[PDB]
Amino acid sequence: SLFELGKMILQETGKNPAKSYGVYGCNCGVGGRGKPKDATDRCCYVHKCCYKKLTGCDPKKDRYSYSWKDKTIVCGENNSCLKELCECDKAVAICLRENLDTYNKKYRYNYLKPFCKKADPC
Amino acid sequence: SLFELGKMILQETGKNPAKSYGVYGCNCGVGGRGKPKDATDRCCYVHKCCYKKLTGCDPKKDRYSYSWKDKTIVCGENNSCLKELCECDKAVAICLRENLDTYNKKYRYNYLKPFCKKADPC
Ligand SMILES: O=C(/C=C/c1ccc(O)c(O)c1)O[C@H](Cc1ccc(O)c(O)c1)C(=O)O
């Protein structure tokens, strides 16, 4: 669910996840996908495509548990949606961390998301 | 389309429409609906429910014709759906104008949109 996703992003990036990514670029947070502005945005693009692969899951509401082993996220749920959502969320939190150095606050509150150029199909 | 809506909002409110309303509250701009935060937001809630009622046209994409003369909006009726779409947009622009007095900049970039409480079904 959103709560787990936010926590993973917070735990991997150290940033306030909704504030920093909730409206970032053409793909992060609210709304859909669009041409990525940068690497951080591409992380979010990939994340939304990851969600789209799933059938019958609710990425916003479906709560799952995850744990830490050796400072790495462990997705141990047996429920297929919960496992897959967890893996999508883990991947985007890692990707956002990996690309932290090019985070650009200019993109943080993108009130022009609806005018983003159309994303390529997932 | 978003172009006519933005034009009406700028005509009626004098505000940069995407900057002022593109991420405002739980209902304005990008994203879906949610419990309205204030009167401006409630304008946006009603607007998105208006869009949901339409049949036969696409509120994001489809252009339509209206006139702005003597600071009054008149919607064209060459197409019945575009007429209704135009009326949705006209109503939100007026509603936003009339609630500018309680516009709250703290709600302008609502990066917590996905955590809005469930909106009233339309
Ligand atoms: O706790 C909530 C929301 C709870 C909630 C309430 C209704 C919903 O429909 C829903 O999906 C969630 O709001 C925020 C939570 C929050 C999450 C991630 C952040 O990065 C943050 O700054 C705040 C707050 O503390 O003000």
Residue numbers in the entry:
A (entry chain B), B (entry chain A): 1 to 13, 15 to 53, 57 to 61, 67 to 90, 92 to 123, 125 to 133
Task: Give passages from the manuscript.
The MjTX-II/RA crystal diffracted up to 1.60 Å and belonged to the P212121 space group. The refinement converged to an Rcryst of 15.7% (Rfree = 19.1%) with one RA molecule located close to the MDiS and helix 1 from monomer A and 392 water molecules. Similar to the PrTX-I/RA complex, the crystal structure of the MjTX-II/RA complex revealed an inhibitor molecule interacting with the toxin; however, RA interacts with both monomers simultaneously and in a different region of MjTX-II. The first benzene ring region of the RA molecule (derived from the diphenyl-lactic acid portion) interacts with the N-terminus of monomer B (Asn17, Pro18 and Ala19 residues). The second benzene ring region of the RA molecule (derived from the caffeic acid portion) interacts with residues of the C-terminal region of monomer A (Leu122, Phe126 and Cys127 residues), which includes the MDiS region. RA prevented approximately 87.3% of the muscle paralysis promoted by MjTX-II in 90 minutes when both were pre-incubated (at a toxin:inhibitor ratio of 1:1, w/w., i.e., 1:40, m/m; N = 3). Several functional/structural studies with PLA2-like toxins and ligands (e.g., aristolochic and chicoric acids, suramin and Zn2+ ions)17,19,23,39 have demonstrated that their binding to the MDiS region is associated with the inhibition of these myotoxins, such as that observed in the crystal structure and functional data of the MjTX-II/RA complex presented here. The average RMS deviation of frame trajectories (ftRMSD) of the RA molecule was 0.22 ± 0.03 nm, indicating that the ligand interacts with the toxin in the same region. However, the RA effect on the MjTX-II quaternary structure results in its disturbance, forcing the toxin into a distorted conformation, evidenced by the increase of its radius of gyration (Rg) from 20.0 to 21.8 Å and COMdisp of 31.5 Å.
